Amino acid sequence: VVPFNGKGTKASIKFQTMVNWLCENRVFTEDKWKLVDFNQYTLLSSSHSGSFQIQSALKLAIYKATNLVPTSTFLLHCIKDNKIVKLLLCQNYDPLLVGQHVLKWIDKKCGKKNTLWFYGPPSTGKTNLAMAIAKSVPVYGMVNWNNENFPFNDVAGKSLVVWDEGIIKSTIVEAAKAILGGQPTRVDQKMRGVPVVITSNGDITFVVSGNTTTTVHAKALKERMVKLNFTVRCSPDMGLLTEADVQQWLTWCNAQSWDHYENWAINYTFDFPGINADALHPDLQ
Amino acid sequence: VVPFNGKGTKASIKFQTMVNWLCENRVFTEDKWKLVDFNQYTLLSSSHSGSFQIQSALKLAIYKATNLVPTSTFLLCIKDNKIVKLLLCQNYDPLLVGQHVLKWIDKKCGKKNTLWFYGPPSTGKTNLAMAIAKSVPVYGMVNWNNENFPFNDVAGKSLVVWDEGIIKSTIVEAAKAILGGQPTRVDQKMRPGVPVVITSNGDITFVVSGNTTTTVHAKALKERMVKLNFTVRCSPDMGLLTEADVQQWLTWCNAQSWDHYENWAINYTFDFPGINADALHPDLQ
Amino acid sequence: VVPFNGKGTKASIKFQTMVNWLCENRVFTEDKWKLVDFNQYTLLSSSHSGSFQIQSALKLAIYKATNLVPTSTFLLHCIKDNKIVKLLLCQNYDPLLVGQHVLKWIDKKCGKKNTLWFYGPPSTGKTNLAMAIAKSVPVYGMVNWNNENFPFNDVAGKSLVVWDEGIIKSTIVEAAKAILGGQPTRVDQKMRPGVPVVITSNGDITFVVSGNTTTTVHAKALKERMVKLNFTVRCSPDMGLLTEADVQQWLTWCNAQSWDHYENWAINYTFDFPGINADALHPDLQ
Amino acid sequence: VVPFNGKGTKASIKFQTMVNWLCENRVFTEDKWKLVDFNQYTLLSSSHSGSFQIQSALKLAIYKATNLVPTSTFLLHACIKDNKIVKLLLCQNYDPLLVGQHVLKWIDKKCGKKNTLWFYGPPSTGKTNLAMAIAKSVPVYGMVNWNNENFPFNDVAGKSLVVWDEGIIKSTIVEAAKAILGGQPTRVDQKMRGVPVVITSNGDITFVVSGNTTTTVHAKALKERMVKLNFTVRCSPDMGLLTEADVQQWLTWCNAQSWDHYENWAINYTFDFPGINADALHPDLQ
Ligand SMILES: Nc1ncnc2c1ncn2[C@@H]1O[C@H](COP(=O)(O)OP(=O)(O)NP(=O)(O)O)[C@@H](O)[C@H]1O
Ligand SMILES: Nc1ncnc2c1ncn2[C@@H]1O[C@H](COP(=O)(O)OP(=O)(O)NP(=O)(O)O)[C@@H](O)[C@H]1O
Ligand SMILES: Nc1ncnc2c1ncn2[C@@H]1O[C@H](COP(=O)(O)OP(=O)(O)NP(=O)(O)O)[C@@H](O)[C@H]1O
Ligand SMILES: Nc1ncnc2c1ncn2[C@@H]1O[C@H](COP(=O)(O)OP(=O)(O)NP(=O)(O)O)[C@@H](O)[C@H]1O
Ligand SMILES: [Mg+2]
Ligand SMILES: [Mg+2]
Ligand SMILES: [Mg+2]
Ligand SMILES: [Mg+2]
């Protein structure tokens, strides 16, 4: 398609540069804007013709970082010193293979399997890892914040959705399968998928119907999930994980060979394969 | 009727050019505009008087492509084509089917405004429906609309799709109007017929009423439908039929002789006739 | 368990004989009592005490014919000339095998497959055969009488449930599966065996209505509970109404013959009803 | 079917006698009993054990005169030109004998689907007078005008005749009206277990009302269930009111004559009723 012949004035052009400035600094909310740059926020809000541009610039900045720029481009900025690499080795999982899946999963390239699942006993790093990734994406939603009756609202404009320590009820089991499967919502189709990560101590394939466990949806939920078993406690020295840990870890994994990935990626298994001593990278051996 | 004499200004002329640009590139929604041309969208939304033009232009662009211009103009080796293989495998004359679609999509079949695809599952019923539905300017689906109010938002569409449809007694009287091409009562007082395609694994002539099927409406529905039997299963690798195949197929059907179709057009039959080995046009014999 | 040692008076014994009389003559409703025995109905309703026995005797009479007696006994009592035998031959189904399956199905001995499904084009004897079976059992009720949003009320206390020209919606699809599979309703568990179901339809009922669409998520589950018969061959318009004498004669004849093939199939029930084997047909039907 | 051999006491026998007395003297309502026999009515209500017998007697009396005894017997009584009914039918160019032989079949539900009589024409032609005359003769009769507007067909069972004076059919009730006009029992009666109908009108009732608009979609289906008589010639102003004595005399006379003229018309039940043949009219009416 040929771009339109229209030419913008200096006021319109300066607005365009402001939209580009917002994306380049990851400023996607009004509260974030005030902290990052209060002088420009004060100047813009001086008039009704300027306070309008505050709303419009944020709606366009969100769209640019969500539907035009792939999310992985935000994640790409001694490997053994990185806390995430140590954590995945403590859980007996290959740090390279997990990292390569995250790049594919956050880009919605996995097809139906749009859902991750960190499963294990309490205090094993499940919430920390999930929140660390969520901090490194432009905008992320959360089921816990939403209404208890409509947990799957406000999914548009989110590059990621975090469902921490959640359980699937029968009243929302049908809406869950749509979101977990990456299928766009019926409302989205009429008015026109987001990666989902779940942490849990119990098996979420058991749907809560009334006061009774049900296993009707066991197969449907497994076709959409990839499960990681976090069954080993982490030393308290781990503390809180930073965004730079994710960026360093994912940048290294992207530059390595992908050959091991598509071999497993041909047959998407519900459970993530464990460590094999043959396929370990020499840097981690 | 002579057009109004008064000429416009530079600002209004540029808006008119933008409207003609939207129709050319088949941009009828804001999301389609952002994906195609984010630059012009950003500049327009720099002011209140600019974001007004975005809403005003799209409403005129949709109206131009639906009411002022015939839909067939947006629709426009022969054996190699996937669709003609699909039609021949079902033992239906490809020239007759293509010549019917052009007259049907233009709302010129009188009372028989509705096509119907019937047959066993996985025989390409929905695949062909989407191919035609994706080529028209704007298409709507009964699935998207509200469960108890399925025929809202039917104006402004070039085609309405009813996939896996079943006619309930609560909407059977509303369905008969839209199936026959009769304009809706609200459309009358705020002032016009849209083609409908139905794909179903079952005989939709059977109307559901409670926990029981009734045939009192069978004769009336047969007056408005045209039926195609997709009985033979197709190749497992048929693939997604695209806009290019529809444009190729209908263009060839338009070029050939129309005398054969007008014999059938004199009296419309509920069942669509099959191929005659000698009446088949020499490009396909 | 030993019955209680107590004995009744003259009045209590006469009431017991009245309850037995209702079962023999199949009087399970007041309207049936009025048609048959108006004299005894007039004598009983002459007082408030007597009118109580009318309501109470029907409760025990219906219960005896539904729980204390197998339903096959009320079905039992030239075979080629039987109209049902003619109907099953036109549709290419073995009369001996159909009858032998009905007897076990009407007695809830088929396990999961508690449902019979008749399918075919219109005017093929689907309702006729179903109605004849339905009117031969002591008490029958149809889904077509119940409320639209509560199709399965009054199911308990019946010998058969008929669902004529029926279709399954996603709102009741969960309630339907329990009854079709013979699983007792939740309310029955906390207030205390299912009821055999026969369904006739011109379309495929495995498809489940949801909104204005069709779905097959319940297609596999429903097939585990139903046995399907294909009523495709057009019948002669002068076949007429199938009667109880046709049903009783047909089932009694099937009960008399050997079951040898039936145990072979009954090892693993299939969804579709198997067709006729020309060599396995009984010589009395040849 | 052998009746139960239980024999009641003296008190129960007397109640049975009182049931036979109510049916004999056409006493079917509480008020009618007070007019006909106040001495017995006072005696029964002297105690609670007695005032219960009153309700049970009326329930059985209405049933015996509606569901067990044919209605035609009560229309019959236990110069023909002297009857004012024949005068009315002659003016409308209708053979008086053929009309009477039809009523004996229409009131007994024997006319198949064509269950409802329709009287049509300009005002003051005796449509209501004739219809109310037959209505007053049957044991128990109900009217649609008495029932509430939203549910016109409550309390239909237990009635020997339903009258619909100057009626109009709305689309909200057209589906329910089709069953009662066609003689089909309603859904309620089927689960808890045919009434002749007469309609008079100044206009075409087949024009079903729908909103502020008149539609003809149901006209063909309604015509399948009605018989029409066109009352056009205005009667003499001194017509008076038709009585049950005239209905009993006219209908009894029509029973005695031959039926071959009517039995031939029953071969094809047309919508309109045939007119007078100048030479086929019975000699007594000449
Ligand atoms: N805010 C924090 N500050 C310091 N250390 C933290 C913090 N959050 C988590 N940790 C450390 O991270 C490790 C596990 O934490 P966490 O991710 O919360 O496990 P968890 O599985 O989510 N607990 P649970 O929610 O019950 O499943 C421990 O070593 C904690 O000390
Ligand atoms: N997205 C797709 N990509 C490739 N092939 C497809 C796709 N969708 C359908 N097909 C093929 O199209 C053929 C028929 O599919 P489909 O159009 O879905 O039939 P269908 O009638 O819609 N099934 P049903 O809805 O149950 O009646 C098969 O050979 C499929 O493999
Ligand atoms: N009451 C009846 N009187 C006369 N013939 C009857 C009657 N009931 C059924 N038949 C005949 O029985 C045959 C099949 O009728 P029926 O059993 O009603 O098929 P059907 O499946 O119920 N029709 P449909 O509901 O459209 O599928 C036809 O030849 C009918 O004429
Ligand atoms: N109770 C009565 N006493 C005397 N004359 C009566 C009585 N009822 C009706 N008539 C007469 O009977 C004739 C016919 O009137 P009627 O039977 O009421 O027709 P109608 O159908 O009621 N008029 P309409 O309802 O407008 O079509 C008239 O001459 C009336 O005066
Ligand atoms: Mg946690
Ligand atoms: Mg499909
Ligand atoms: Mg039927
Ligand atoms: Mg009047």
Author numbering:
A (entry chain L): 202 to 278, 286 to 400, 407 to 499
B (entry chain G): 202 to 277, 286 to 400, 406 to 499
C (entry chain F): 202 to 278, 286 to 400, 406 to 499
D (entry chain E): 202 to 279, 286 to 400, 407 to 499
Provide text from the study.
The main replication protein NS1 plays a critical role in cell cycle arrest, transactivation of viral and host genes, and replication and package of B19V genome. The SF3 HD domain of NS1 belongs to the SF3 helicase superfamily, which unwinds DNA with 3′→5′ polarity. Totally, four cryo-electron microscopy (cryo-EM) structures were determined, which revealed the detailed mechanisms for ATP binding and hydrolysis and DNA binding and unwinding by NS1.
Based on these observations, we constructed and purified the NS1_200-501 protein, which is composed of the OD and SF3 HD domains. To further verify the assembly of NS1_200-501, we also performed cryo-EM study and solved one NS1_200-501/AMPPNP complex at an overall resolution of 3.5 Å. Indicated by the low RMSD value (0.7 Å), the conformation and assembly of the NS1_200-501/AMPPNP complex are very similar to that of the NS1_2-570/AMPPNP structure. Like NS1_2-570, the size-exclusion chromatography profile suggests that NS1_200-501 exists as dodecamer. Although no DNA unwinding activity is observed for the K334A mutant, WT NS1_200-501 can efficiently unwind the DNA. The DNA unwinding activity of WT NS1_200-501 is comparable to that of WT NS1_2-570.
